[PDB]
Amino acid sequence: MDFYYLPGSAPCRAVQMTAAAVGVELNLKLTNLMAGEHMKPEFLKINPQHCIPTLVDNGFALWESRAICTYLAEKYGKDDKLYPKDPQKRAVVNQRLYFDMGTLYQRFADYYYPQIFAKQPANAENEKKMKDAVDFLNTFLDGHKYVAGDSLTIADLTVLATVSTYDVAGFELAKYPHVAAWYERTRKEAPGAAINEAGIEEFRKYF
Amino acid sequence: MDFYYLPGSAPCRAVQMTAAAVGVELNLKLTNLMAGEHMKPEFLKINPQHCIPTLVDNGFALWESRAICTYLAEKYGKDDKLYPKDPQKRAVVNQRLYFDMGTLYQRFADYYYPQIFAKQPANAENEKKMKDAVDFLNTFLDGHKYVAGDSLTIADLTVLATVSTYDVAGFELAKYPHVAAWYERTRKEAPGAAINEAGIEEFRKYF
Ligand SMILES: N[C@@H](CCC(=O)N[C@@H](CS)C(=O)NCC(=O)O)C(=O)O
Ligand SMILES: N[C@@H](CCC(=O)N[C@@H](CS)C(=O)NCC(=O)O)C(=O)O
Secondary structure (H helix, E strand, C coil): CEEEECCCCHHHHHHHHHHHHCCCCCEEEECCHHHCHHHCHHHHHHCCCCCCCEEEECCEEEECHHHHHHHHHHHHCCCHHHCCCCHHHHHHHHHHHHHHHHHHHHHHHHHHHHHHHCCCCCCHHHHHHHHHHHHHHHHHCCCCCECCECCCCHHHHHHHHHHHHHHHCCCCHHHCHHHHHHHHHHCCCCCCHHHHHHHHHHHHHHC | CEEEECCCCHHHHHHHHHHHHCCCCCEEEECCHHHCHHHCHHHHHHCCCCCCCEEEECCEEEECHHHHHHHHHHHHCCCCCCCCCCHHHHHHHHHHHHHHHHHHHHHHHHHHHHHHCCCCCCCHHHHHHHHHHHHHHHHHCCCCCCCCCCCCCHHHHHHHHHHHHHHHHCCCHHHCHHHHHHHHHHHHHCCCHHHHHHHHHHHHCCC
16 A cells, blocks of 8 residues: 655644554655645546645545554554454544644644745744643543543544644643653654654754 | 524534444524633633533543544444445545545644734745645546445535535635535535534625
8 A cells, every 4th residue: 555645744644653553554755745646647646635644545545544544443453452352432532632632743843834935923812722632631631541432542642643733843842741641652653653754854844 | 402503603513424424412592702712711621722512421521623523423324335444445534534624624724713813915836835735626526426435424514514605715625526516416415404504694794
């Protein structure tokens, strides 16, 4: 299966760790957006939204990092813990996946991207929204050892990719006890952790 | 099961149509955000992210509309077509769910809400991104009759909740033939269609 990605990308790193978790080997396809490789006619045929990560598994094209992670868990995973079949348990996992996309990473991007690509001054309003997002995550972790329960799931993997990004950007995770502790634990227990660590160094080249 | 909602809210309507599709009755609990009812202690105890929709099913509290929709489908659904178990088919539906949230609705909200509620000037670039989101959906709908595959799924229901809102907001959907055709067909066929139409009228009360 081909994996169109960029090493420093969080959504890409989330899939990489999930693939490691289920023992699936990804045929890496470095896709340089600055060379318009995602806009090649061949790529558009695979993914009209022309975005990475994009996975192609024996003719089946799929994008949206979290959808890819769930796909790999359902089709190639054997350990129910990573993505529980029980509706209730799976629902908490799914809610956290949406949280990661629409709240945690979304606010991170809203605050840092303008400073990185537009050279705009740090926006106070968006800084607080980002802070509120980590606060939520901190609350989600109160009591439980993992983001969506008591066992490592793909929700921890995608949130790790995101939080490891907050880290390299210089965000103060230490002011969120549960997040900081979970991060330290998960950064050492996540399958493919070494790939994630190598990847953030590429993202670091943005600051 | 309790359903904390507001009729005009798109994410809430997505859950209402999904519930109707699976024969699940929802005890409606109007939660007026303008009156700050989403921050009442009792509600924060159930949902610390203080957002609607929030579902409580025999003690189990859940938020994030699309996670509620899939939960209702997995636990109470009996028509595999609504949310296919096959990993690949499921993956296509799931990618569309993330599309609906992170691309289609996200851009709609970022463009209109700051104007309607915060009374801020329109943001031209955000308008452009919004057009790009509908364009993507238009392409997805080229050939394919439903948002995901050749049958109505929960992806059609949430996209209807989102697109119907684009409609009342005055966005020119007509310029996207495949989106417009799909909408013309689905706004009638969809389970809970009448609920959604009534809900958008309550949303209109903001224009
Ligand atoms: N929500 C998506 C985000 C995908 C995304 O933002 N992709 C970026 C790379 S970080 C991209 O390909 N941008 C170029 C484009 O969309 O044309 C996911 O989780 O996969
Ligand atoms: N991604 C969420 C969006 C939830 C959302 O935006 N909820 C709004 C109502 S439309 C809300 O409760 N806002 C007030 C708040 O979050 O405090 C979903 O699909 O449920």
